[PDB]
């Protein structure tokens, strides 16, 4: 049949946030109970659930009568976006073996045996657990990547999907890709609690927290294709996103990192002058098998709205016109290109920060857009002159300026418009805001 129709018809539970209220929009009307300390924060598409480590921070879904998907060997899929802060070297050492659940249908410490299923975390491992009425259990243990810059449990919003085929295996997907599997054949009937609990259970780290979004459940095992579509259907483009996957915002400091070479930071030659790439330093921990380029080094940029267009939205929308500034010494300096400004072969125009030569027009009208790579939280910036003609997308060009050493200098070029289909490009940028979910060790 039709994939979109299948995804829709197979849904028996779909949590959505509207008017700051959490509820089931699947159509089955399951009751949703939000506790006092269950917080709401920016999400992949609207707001998301944020859970802290105390008993007041939880969300309970009491299943409607008709919603029975874990019947006698009935296939089912659970999906939701997830965001877990990067685990510090210390905490990894201190709480590494502490496995705690965050989502579960298992009623614990009571009359029934270990009920249905659970999603738990243990160090840098994501775990899916299935337990039947007899107490038999099956598990999928996913070990995150060593390089936290590209890891799935390192402060970025990632899409999780776990499919369960009672005649074969349980499969764990992340951003639409298979990351783990486990045969579940031989398992008997699952008799879970009529309650689906979103809460940190048995977590020894008082500072631990997580964010969960679009929690959904299907009454069938979605296939790769259906999962791919589900995943991408959430990638709306109304708003642009920062490095963590949250809505891009105005009047906010962001470090820029070129997607094409995530190893570089941005530096400024001098006020009124040009910008260029630098080698960011890395953190490495052999015994913990964890490493990553450090963040928060290099220039700090701020996005300001070009003009107020009836309504002031704190979020930057794709297509919004803006003015880019860099914060240097408690002062904000406009980024742009002055008329007749030095440029590589008259095509790659070298950007200037705080250029102020009297009598010389300085072009600064930029447009923040999302022109490619919808799965990555990157952004493109387009520069225009006073005649609203395109001076090109922002990127870099290797060369020299006077006696300075060879560098990858920040430029604006229209040349990128003829390669918008490449895997990697050069005009793609990550906007990185300081975040408590990531601190360099
Ligand atoms: N309008 C002309 C001439 C001009 C006079 C004075 C002034 O303050 C700026 C310009 C012009 O465009 N001159 C510029 C070209 C544009 C530009 O460089 O951004 C020019 O010739 N600049 C010199 C000086 C310069 C530029 N980038 C530098 C980086 C390090 C050190 C010196 C730099 C140039 O290099 O071309």
3-state secondary structure the chain: CCHHHHHHHCEEEEEEEECCEEEECCCCCCEEEECCCCEEEEECCEEEEEEECCCCCCEEEECCCCCCCCCCCCCEEEEEEEECCCCCHHHHHHHCCCCEEEEECCCCCCCCCCCCEEEEEECCEEEEEEECCCCCEEEEEEECCCECCCCCCCCCCEEEEEEECCCCEEEEEECCEEEEEEECCCCCCCCCCCEEEEEEECCCCCCCEEEEEEEEEECCCCCHHHHHHHHHHCCCCCECECCCCCECECCCEEEEEEHHHCCEEEEECCCCCCEEEEECCEEEECCCCEEEECCCCCCCEEEEECCCCCCCCCECECCEEEEEEEECCCCEEEEEEECCCCEECCCEEECEECCCCCCCCEECEEEEECCCCCCCCCEEEEEECCCCCEEEEEEEEEECCCCCCCEEEEEEEHHHHHCCCCCCCCCCEEEECCECCECCC
Alpha-carbon distance 285 to 54, whole Å? 31
Q: Is the dihedral of CA 436, 97, 100, 128 positive or negative?
A: positive
| Placement of tokens 């999907």 in the chain | 161
- Cα(188) to centroid(ligand 1), Å: 76
Q: Domains for the chain: give ranges and CATH numbers.
A: 1-235 (2.60.120.200), 236-441 (2.80.10.50)
Q: How far is CA 278 from CA 4, 299, 401, in A?
A: 45, 11, 16
CB 408 within 8 A of CB 353: no
Degrees, nearest 5: CA angle 149-154-155? 110
Burial of 18 (0-12, 13-18, 19+ CB in 10 A): exposed
Please tell me the distance between residue 108's alpha carbon and the centre of ligand 1 in angstroms: 70
Rounded-to-10 torsion of CA 111, 114, 117, 118? 100
Q: Ligand 1 mean position to 257 CA, how many Å? A: 26
CA 120 – CA 383 distance, rounded (Å): 46
Among protein residues, the one with the nearest Cα to ligand 1's atom 34 is: 342
Q: Among 357, 410, 411, which is best to mutate for testing ligand 1, by the most ligand atoms less than 8 A from CB?
A: 357
Q: Atom 7 of ligand 1 has which residue's CA nearest to it?
A: 357
Question: Can you tell me which atom of ligand 1 is nearest the CA of 357?
Answer: 8
- Tell me the sheet residues that pair with 397: 409
Name the nearest CA neighbour of 91 among 133, 37, 53, 131: 53
Hey, which residues does 128 pair with through a beta bridge?
119, 140
- Technique of determination: X-ray
Residues with a CB atom less than 6 Å from ligand 1: 269, 273-274, 338, 340-342, 350, 352, 357, 360, 401-402, 404
- Cα 284 to averaged position of ligand 1 atoms, centre (Å): 41
In units of Å, what resolution does this entry have?
2.2
The CA-atom distances, in angstroms, between 279 and each of 272, 297, 401 are: 23, 10, 19
Give the nearest ligand 1 atom to 339 CA: 12
In the numeric block, the tokens 């939000």 are attached to 34
Find, among 257, 272, 276, the residue nearest to 352 by Cα: 272
Distance 390 CA to ligand 1 centre (A): 22
Strand partners, 91: none
* Rounded Cα–Cα distance for residues 146 and 164 (Å): 28
Of 93, 433, 375, 414, nearest to 236 by C-alpha is 375
CA of 38 to the centre of ligand 1 (A): 55
d(C-alpha 353, C-alpha 356), whole Å: 9
Query: Is 128 within 8 Å of 134 (Cβ atoms)?
Result: no
**Which residues are within 8 A (CB) of 132 and not within 5 positions of it... i.e. 6 or more apart?**
187, 188, 189, 190, 191
What whole-number distance in Å separates Cα of residue 50 and Cα of residue 82? 10
Contact status, residue 438 vs residue 155, Cβ threshold 8 Å: yes
Q: CA 178 to CA 175: how far, in whole Å?
A: 9
16: tokens are 């959505």
CA proximity to 219, closest of 440, 437, 14: 14
What is the rounded (10 degree) CA torsion for 258, 262, 268, 273? -30
């Amino acid at each position: 049949e039709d994939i979109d129709v299948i995804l829709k018809k197979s849904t028996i539970l779909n949590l959505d946030i509207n008017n700051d209220i959490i509820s089931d929009i699947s159509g089955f009307n399951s009751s949703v109970i939000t506790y006092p300390d269950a917080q709401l924060v920016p999400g992949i598409n609207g707001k998301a659930i944020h859970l802290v480590n105390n008993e007041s921070s939880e969300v309970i879904v009491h299943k409607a009568m008709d919603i029975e998907y874990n019947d006698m060997f009935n296939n089912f899929t659970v999906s939701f976006w997830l965001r877990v802060p990067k685990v510090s070297a210390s905490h990894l050492e201190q709480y590494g073996t502490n496995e705690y659940s965050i989502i579960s249908s298992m009623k614990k410490h009571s009359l029934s045996i270990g009920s249905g299923w659970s999603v738990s975390l243990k160090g840098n491992n994501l775990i899916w657990t299935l337990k039947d009425s007899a107490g038999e259990v099956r598990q999928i243990t996913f070990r995150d990547l060593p390089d936290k810059f590209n890891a799935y449990l390192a402060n970025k919003w990632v899409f999780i999907t776990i499919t369960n085929d009672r005649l074969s295996s349980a499969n764990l997907y992340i951003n639409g890709v298979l990351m783990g599997s486990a045969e579940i054949t031989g398992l008997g009937a699952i008799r879970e609690d009529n309650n689906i609990t979103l809460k940190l259970d048995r977590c020894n780290n008082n500072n631990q927290y997580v964010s969960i979004d679009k929690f959904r459940i299907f009454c069938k095992a979605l296939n790769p294709k259906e999962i791919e579509k589900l995943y991408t259907s959430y990638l709306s483009i109304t708003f642009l996103r920062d490095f963590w996957g949250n809505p891009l915002r105005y009047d906010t400091e962001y470090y820029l990192i070129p997607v094409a070479s995530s190893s570089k930071d941005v530096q400024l030659k001098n006020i009124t002058d040009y910008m260029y790439l630098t080698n960011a330093p890395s953190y490495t921990n052999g015994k913990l098998n964890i490493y990553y380029r450090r963040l928060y080094n290099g220039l700090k940029f701020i996005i300001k709205r070009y003009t107020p267009n009836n309504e002031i939205d704190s979020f930057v929308k794709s297509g919004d016109f803006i003015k880019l500034y860099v914060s240097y010494n408690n002062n904000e300096h406009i980024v742009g290109y002055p008329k007749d400004g030095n440029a590589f072969n008259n095509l790659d125009r070298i950007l200037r920060v705080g250029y102020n030569a009297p009598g010389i027009p300085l072009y600064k009208k930029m447009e923040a857009v999302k022109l490619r790579d919808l799965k990555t939280y990157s952004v493109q910036l387009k520069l225009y002159d006073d005649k609203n003609a395109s001076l090109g997308l922002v990127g870099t060009h290797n060369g020299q300026i006077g006696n300075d050493p060879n560098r990858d200098i920040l430029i604006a070029s229209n040349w990128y418009f003829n390669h918008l289909k490449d895997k990697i490009l050069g005009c793609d940028w990550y906007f990185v805001p300081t975040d408590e979910g990531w601190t360099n060790d």
